[PDB]
Symmetry: C2
Subunit: 245 residues, 2 copies
């Protein structure tokens, strides 16, 4: 499993600051062993793909489930591909809780993006009241199944364990809590899909990952990378990419 | 009131086909008396703005209510202005009924796009069941009010009456049914805002406008232009722009 690091710019940037950020990234010393993808605002996807080194992938932050049609405000996987992007982030928790995206919609988007040849970084994670109610497992397994039931080819899927309570709060999950969930997801994969899928699929961690935080998270056996929010907008992002060095 | 025509491309095109379409608009003979705006998919806004003649405006099909933050999949007015677009379409029936945007949310979005310097094409419209119930008026005054409560400067606002039953169905409102709502909205503005706002605000009609239909609807006294979907992707778009000629 190749170490995977995804930066999610979320709703941040202009061409001037995304330009600086990109310049830095292109000049940096990035492990040859980490696979890097940056998730840019839709408005900036083409600029990002044009400016970023080809060795770095570009992902869309969201998409809809059909190729064209009367959906004012949406973009499809066909348009994403047209600009040169290779990934889409689906199921992010902000899409789930701020915008009401249901597991059923998310599963339809995954199957569509996959049909169109995009790679998918699919997000799952419980809320704190769920953690504390002792149902983490139930919740993540329910969200994972909705995704899995819509995946025919795992070669282009990256699972992202994103506990809602850790996203932008500073409350990173300890390495032990990340490791506990990733191990159980990998276990789920093995029993519901296959050993072969369990072993090759990357399961990345997201939620308040920092240059300071990463080494320790990264040494966990079932952690294959990170999905970085706030820190992907900073030079330490380069430190996260090289977390295994 | 300067006649206004907005083309909403919705979720369609690639660089090649939008490029062709754009070339068509740049070389066509377009009425100097019509204000034209093309609403491009977010992923193509910068491309559109760069290839389109400066006389034709560019509009985003949607935006969020803050300049930046943790809103994966969203874009803000600051970004829209960064690439040179001057408008945004808000409250479109597809955003309202497919993506559940509420009146409160649409309102907050208007107030922000406006504080930020963009013009807003704001949509209102009843569903078939409301028309049949005879409540078209109650419904548009209510949606209208939700927009108005957030407008300080009406000079950068275009009201689009887009009955849902007319969107993409082929079922165009009749010249007399469009005229009757427009006159009602204009009087709404007159009693609730001011006579000057009423007099100066453009009220455009959306819903199955074709090269075929346009002349008779444009002849109605309170109909200031059109919001065009499906036909904005065709040559006939030029005829619509030129409806009063």
């Amino acid at each position: 499993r190749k170490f995977f690091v995804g930066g999610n710019w979320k709703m941040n940037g202009d061409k001037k600051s995304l330009g600086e950020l990109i310049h830095t990234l292109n000049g940096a010393k990035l492990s040859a062993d980490t696979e890097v993808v940056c998730g840019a605002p839709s408005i900036y996807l083409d600029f990002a793909r044009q400016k970023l080194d080809a060795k770095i992938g570009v992902a869309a932050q969201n998409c809809y489930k059909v190729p064209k049609g009367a959906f004012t405000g949406e973009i499809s996987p066909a348009m994403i591909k047209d600009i040169g992007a290779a990934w889409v982030i689906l199921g992010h928790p902000e899409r789930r809780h701020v915008f009401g995206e249901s597991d059923e919609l998310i599963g339809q988007k995954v199957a569509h993006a996959l049909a169109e040849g995009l790679g998918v970084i699919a997000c799952i994670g419980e809320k704190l009241d769920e953690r504390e109610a002792g149902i983490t497992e139930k919740v993540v397994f329910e969200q994972t199944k909705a995704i899995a039931d819509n995946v025919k080819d795992w070669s282009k899927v990256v699972l992202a364990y994103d506990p809602v309570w850790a996203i932008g709060t500073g409350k990173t999950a300890t390495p032990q809590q990340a490791q506990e969930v990733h191990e159980k997801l990998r276990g789920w994969l093995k029993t519901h899909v296959s050993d072969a899928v369990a072993q090759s699929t990357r399961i990345i961690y997201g939620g308040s990952v920092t240059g300071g935080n990463c080494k320790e998270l990264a040494s966990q056996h079932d952690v294959d990378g990170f999905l970085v929010g706030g820190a992907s907008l900073k030079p330490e992002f380069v430190d996260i990419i090289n977390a295994k060095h």
